[PDB]
Design a protein around this ligand. Structure first.
Ligand SMILES: C=CC1=C(C)/C(=C/c2[nH]c(/C=C3N=C(/C=C4\NC(=O)C(C)=C4C=C)C(C)=C\3CCC(=O)O)c(CCC(=O)O)c2C)NC1=O
Ligand SMILES: *[C@@H]1O[C@H](CO)[C@@H](O[C@@H]2O[C@H](CO)[C@@H](O)[C@H](O)[C@H]2NC(C)=O)[C@H](O)[C@H]1NC(C)=O
Ligand SMILES: *[C@@H]1O[C@H](CO)[C@@H](O)[C@H](O)[C@H]1NC(C)=O
Ligand SMILES: *[C@@H]1O[C@H](CO)[C@@H](O)[C@H](O)[C@H]1NC(C)=O
Ligand SMILES: *[C@@H]1O[C@H](CO)[C@@H](O)[C@H](O)[C@H]1NC(C)=O
Ligand SMILES: *[C@@H]1O[C@H](CO)[C@@H](O)[C@H](O)[C@H]1NC(C)=O
Ligand SMILES: *[C@@H]1O[C@H](CO)[C@@H](O)[C@H](O)[C@H]1NC(C)=O
Ligand SMILES: *[C@@H]1O[C@H](CO)[C@@H](O)[C@H](O)[C@H]1NC(C)=O
Ligand SMILES: *[C@@H]1O[C@H](CO)[C@@H](O)[C@H](O)[C@H]1NC(C)=O
Ligand SMILES: *[C@@H]1O[C@H](CO)[C@@H](O)[C@H](O)[C@H]1NC(C)=O
Lengths: 49, 50, 299, 250, 50, 50
C-alpha cells in the first residue's frame, strides 16, 4: 500500500476489533469453536457496512 | 445490544420460539408484545446514542 | 436514484421437521387417574413419571374432567412439547375446595395441607368421585389438617399428628381444652351436597425446555434435512433455521447450548446424539443499486 | 442405642472459607462468557466452622442451605441427617453410604445418640421407621487424598444437592484452589428442615459453612466450565468488578 | 374495631366462591383496612356469576 | 424526575410496597413491570436531555 511509515505505525498501534472488513458465511460457520462476537452480531441483523 | 436479547423484560422467557411453542395467541401475544417493546426500546436507545 | 439497504423478504421456509426421542413406551396415565386408592390431602401422593409418551386420549375415550386449568402452558400447545421432569401430585379433597388448588389462593387446603408455588407451571385436573370414593354412612378414610401453628410452604407435606395448642394452655401434647387434634375427616355421602362431594385431583408439575426430555407428547418424528432452512422442533423446542454439524462437549445433564444473546445456538439431537448448530435462513443483507425510476427499471 | 462416654475433643475450630462455595446455577451450557446470578451462595473469605473426630458430632442448625466439605482417605464420613426434632415425631431426611449402596430416606426415625457404622459391621444409627414416603437405593459398590465438597439446600419443596469430588494431596487445611460444584440430585421431599447432623463410621475432619443471599459473577471458559467467580458486596474491589461486569478493572 | 382472622369460618364454614379484586387473598393477613362494609344478601345460584 | 415517581403509569399505586403488601407475584409482577418501565422511561428521557 501507499501508507507512510508513520501511517503504518498508527495502523499497527490502534486495534480494529472487527475481524477486518471481510467475514464470509463460511468463515463464521468454520468458527464454531470460539463463537465470534461479529458472527453473533451478524446472525441477529446487525451488520457493519 | 446483543446482550439485551437475553432480557425477559418481565416475560416468561427471552426466546420467541419457547413462548410460541408453549403459549397460544390470546395471552401469548401479550408476552410477545412485551419482548417487542423491550427490544424496540433497546434499538431506539442504541440509535439515539449513535 | 441511489442504493437502498432493502428489507429481507426473499426467502421463506417451506417445510417442517419434527425430531423427538425414540421412546415407544405408553405412559402410566391409568395408575394415577384409574387408581383404587388416592392419597389423602394431608399426605398427598407425589408420583414421579418418566419414560413416557403422553397422549391423554384414553382419558378422552373414558374420562370426563370437571376442571382442566393449565398455568404457563395453554393446553392446545401441549401436544407438541416435551418435559424435563414430571411429578403427579395426586389426592382427594372436598368439592368446593377445588377452587383452592391454584396459585395465590388461600384456605385450609392451601394453607395447612397443600400449597403451590406462585410461579407454578403445569396443569391442575379435577373431577368428581362422589360415586366411587363416597359411601353411605360417611367415608372417614380421607382426612385433612384443620389447625397449624403457621402457614405451609409450596409442596411441603406435614404429616405430623401432635396436638395443636389452640389456647395458652400447655396440655402436654395430649387432648384437652383449648388444644385439639389437628387432623379432621370429611363425611362423604352420595346424597350430600355438591360442595361436600369428594373430588379426585391430580396436579402435573413440570418445567419446560431447560434440561433433557424423557417424557413427551405423541407427535411422530421425521428425518432431518441439513444445509436448508427448515421449521424444526427438537424436544418441543421449535424454531426456524438451517441445521449444520457442530462439535460441542455437552455435559450429561446439559441439553441446550446458548450464545451471547441467550438464544439457542445448538441442539443435541434426541435420537442420534450429535450436536447441530442453528443459523438463520435470511443471513446476509441485500442492497439494491438502481437509477431512479422515471428513467429505467434495471437494477 | 449406645451412648458415648470417652471424648478427646476441643473447642470448635474456625477457618476461612474462600474461593469455594460456588455451584452451577442451572443446567445450561454456555462458554467463554460472564454471567451474573443472584442466589444463596457461600460468601468468600467468610468464617467456616472446622470440626475434628475425637482422637461425637454435634447437631447443627440448617439455615437457608448449608455448605459442607470434607477431606477423606478411608470413607469415614458416611452420611447426613436433616430435620427439626429428629426423634421419629416428624419426617427426617436421611442419607447414608454403608460401603455397598447409597441410601436416601424420609422415614420417621428414632436416631441413635451416637451414629457408628462399619469399623466393619454394626449399622447402628436409628431405631424406628414408620410412615415413610420415599426410598432411593443405588447399585452395589465397594495425608488425605480425596476432597468432597457438597451443597445441601431446600428450596420450595425440592432438596437440591450439588457436589464435587476431586483428588488432593493436603492434610493441614482446606486448599486454596478453585472448583465449581455440579448439580447432582434434586429430590421432591416437601420437608421443613431446620437442623442437621453428620454421620461417621467408627484421622478425620470436616468443615461447615452457611449460605447467604448474594449476587455472583461466574466465568465460563471455552469449554463451558466455571473457572473463576467474583462475589458481590464482599469488598469495594469485588463490588467494582460486580457493577462493571468484568474481572479486570482499569 | 376488629381483628380479622377468618379462621372460624375455616373451622366451620366452606365457601363455594372467594374472589378478591385488587387484593389477592394470601396477602390479606398482613393488611389493615380504613373502612369495611359487608354487603350481605341472598340470590339465586346461577346469578352468583353476576 | 422526582415528580415522576408519583406517576402510576396505569398501576393501582405509585408505591412499590403498597403493591407488594396488597398483591402477590402472579399478577403483582405486571404492575411492578409497569412501574419499572415507566420509571426507566423517565430516566432514559432525562439522560437523553442531559
Ligand atoms: C452418602 C451419599 C453419597 C453420595 C451423594 C454420592 C455421590 C457419588 N459418589 C460417587 C463416587 C464415589 N463416592 C465414594 C465415597 C463416598 N462419596 C460420598 O459422598 C460419601 C459420603 C462417600 C463415603 C464416605 C467413592 C469411593 C467413589 C468412587 C471414587 C473412585 O473412583 O475411587 C459418584 C459417582 C458414581 C460413579 O461414577 O461410580 C456419585 C454420584 N456417594 C455417596 O456415598
Ligand atoms: C419449620 O420448623 C421450625 C422449627 O419448629 C418452625 O419455626 C418455629 O415455629 C414455632 C411455632 O410457630 C415457633 O415457636 C418458633 O419460634 C419457630 N422457630 C424458628 C427458628 O422460626 C417453622 O415454622 C417450621 N416451618 C413451617 C413452614 O411451619
Ligand atoms: C432411536 O435410536 C436408535 C439407535 O440410536 C435408532 O436406530 C433409531 O432409528 C431411533 N429411532 C427410533 C424410532 O427407534
Ligand atoms: C379407567 O377405567 C375405565 C372403567 O373402569 C375404563 O373404561 C378406562 O379405559 C380406564 N382407563 C384407562 C386409561 O384404561
Ligand atoms: C404412623 O404409623 C402409625 C402406625 O405405625 C399409625 O397409627 C399412624 O396413623 C401413622 N401416621 C401417619 C401420619 O401416617
Ligand atoms: C419524469 O417524467 C416526466 C414525464 O415522463 C418528465 O417530465 C420529468 O422530467 C421526469 N423527471 C426526471 C427526473 O426524469
Ligand atoms: C443415653 O441413651 C439414652 C437412650 O438409650 C438417651 O435417651 C439418652 O439421652 C442418652 N444420654 C446420653 C448422655 O448420651
Ligand atoms: C471468624 O473469622 C473472622 C475473620 O475471618 C473473625 O473476625 C471472627 O472473629 C471469627 N469468628 C469467631 C467466632 O472468632
Ligand atoms: C447396607 O448394605 C447392604 C448390603 O449391600 C444393603 O443390602 C443395605 O440396603 C444397606 N443399608 C440400608 C439401610 O439399605
Ligand atoms: C477444552 O477441551 C479441549 C478438547 O478436549 C482441550 O484440548 C482443552 O485443553 C480443554 N480446555 C482446558 C482449559 O483444558
Amino acid at each position: 500500500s501507499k501508507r507512510s511509515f508513520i501511517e503504518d505505525l498508527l495502523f499497527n498501534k490502534v486495534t480494529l476489533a472487527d475481524a477486518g472488513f471481510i467475514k464470509q458465511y463460511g468463515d463464521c460457520l468454520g468458527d464454531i469453536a470460539a463463537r465470534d462476537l461479529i458472527c453473533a452480531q451478524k446472525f441477529n441483523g446487525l451488520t457493519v457496512l | 445490544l446483543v446482550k439485551q436479547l437475553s432480557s425477559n423484560f418481565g416475560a416468561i422467557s427471552s426466546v420467541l420460539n419457547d413462548i410460541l411453542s408453549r403459549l397460544c395467541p390470546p395471552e401469548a401475544e401479550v408476552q410477545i408484545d412485551r419482548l417487542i417493546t423491550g427490544r424496540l426500546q433497546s434499538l431506539q436507545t442504541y440509535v439515539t446514542q449513535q | 436514484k441511489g442504493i437502498y439497504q432493502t428489507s429481507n423478504f426473499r426467502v421463506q421456509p417451506t417445510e417442517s421437521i419434527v425430531r423427538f426421542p425414540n421412546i415407544t413406551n405408553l405412559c402410566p396415565f391409568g395408575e394415577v387417574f384409574n387408581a383404587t386408592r388416592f392419597a389423602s390431602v394431608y399426605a398427598w401422593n407425589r408420583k414421579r413419571i418418566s419414560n413416557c409418551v403422553a397422549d391423554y386420549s384414553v382419558l378422552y375415550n373414558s374420562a370426563s374432567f370437571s376442571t382442566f386449568k393449565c398455568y404457563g402452558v395453554c393446553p392446545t400447545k401441549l401436544n407438541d412439547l416435551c418435559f424435563t421432569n414430571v411429578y403427579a401430585d395426586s389426592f382427594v379433597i372436598r368439592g368446593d375446595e377445588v377452587r383452592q388448588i391454584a396459585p395465590g389462593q388461600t384456605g385450609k387446603i392451601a394453607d395447612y395441607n397443600y400449597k403451590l408455588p406462585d410461579d407454578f407451571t403445569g396443569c391442575v385436573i379435577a373431577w368428581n368421585s362422589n360415586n366411587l370414593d363416597s359411601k353411605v354412612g360417611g367415608n372417614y378414610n380421607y382426612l385433612y389438617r384443620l389447625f397449624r401453628k403457621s402457614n405451609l410452604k409450596p409442596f411441603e407435606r406435614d404429616i405430623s399428628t401432635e396436638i395443636y395448642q389452640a389456647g395458652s394452655t400447655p396440655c402436654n401434647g395430649v387432648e384437652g381444652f383449648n388444644c385439639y387434634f389437628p387432623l379432621q375427616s370429611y363425611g362423604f355421602q352420595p346424597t350430600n351436597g355438591v360442595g361436600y362431594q369428594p373430588y379426585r385431583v391430580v396436579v402435573l408439575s413440570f418445567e419446560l425446555l431447560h434440561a433433557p426430555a424423557t417424557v413427551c407428547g405423541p407427535k411422530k418424528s421425521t428425518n432431518l434435512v441439513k444445509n436448508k432452512c427448515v421449521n424444526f422442533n427438537f424436544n418441543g423446542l421449535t424454531g426456524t433455521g438451517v441445521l449444520t454439524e457442530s462439535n460441542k462437549k455437552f455435559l450429561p445433564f446439559q441439553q441446550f447450548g446458548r450464545d451471547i444473546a441467550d438464544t439457542t445456538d445448538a441442539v443435541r439431537d434426541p435420537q442420534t446424539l450429535e450436536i447441530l448448530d442453528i443459523t438463520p435462513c435470511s443471513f446476509g443483507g441485500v442492497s439494491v443499486i438502481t437509477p431512479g425510476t422515471n428513467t429505467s427499471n434495471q437494477v | 442405642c449406645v451412648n458415648l462416654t470417652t471424648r478427646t475433643q476441643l473447642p470448635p475450630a474456625y477457618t476461612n472459607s474462600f474461593t469455594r462455595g460456588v455451584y452451577y446455577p442451572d443446567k445450561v451450557f454456555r462458554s467463554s462468557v460472564l454471567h451474573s446470578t443472584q442466589d444463596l451462595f457461600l460468601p468468600f473469605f467468610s468464617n467456616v466452622t472446622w470440626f475434628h473426630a475425637i482422637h461425637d458430632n454435634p447437631v447443627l442448625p440448617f439455615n437457608d442451605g448449608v455448605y459442607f466439605a470434607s477431606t477423606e482417605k478411608s470413607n469415614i464420613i458416611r452420611g447426613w441427617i436433616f430435620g427439626t426434632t429428629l426423634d421419629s415425631k416428624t419426617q427426617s431426611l436421611l442419607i447414608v453410604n454403608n460401603a455397598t449402596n447409597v441410601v436416601i430416606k424420609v422415614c420417621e426415625f428414632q436416631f441413635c445418640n451416637d451414629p457408628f457404622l462399619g469399623m466393619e459391621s454394626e449399622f447402628r444409627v436409628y431405631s424406628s421407621a414408620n410412615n415413610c414416603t420415599f426410598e432411593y437405593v443405588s447399585q452395589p459398590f465397594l495425608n488425605f487424598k480425596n476432597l468432597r465438597e457438597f451443597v445441601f439446600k431446600n428450596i420450595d419443596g425440592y432438596f437440591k444437592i450439588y457436589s464435587k469430588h476431586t483428588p488432593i494431596n493436603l492434610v493441614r487445611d482446606l486448599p486454596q484452589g478453585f472448583s465449581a460444584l455440579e448439580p447432582l440430585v434434586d429430590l421432591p421431599i416437601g420437608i421443613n428442615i431446620t437442623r442437621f447432623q453428620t454421620l461417621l463410621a467408627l484421622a478425620a475432619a470436616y468443615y461447615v459453612g452457611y449460605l447467604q443471599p448474594r449476587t455472583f459473577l461466574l466465568k465460563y471458559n471455552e469449554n463451558g466450565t466455571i473457572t473463576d467467580a467474583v462475589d458481590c458486596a464482599l469488598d469495594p474491589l469485588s463490588e467494582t468488578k460486580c457493577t462493571l461486569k468484568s474481572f479486570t478493572v482499569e
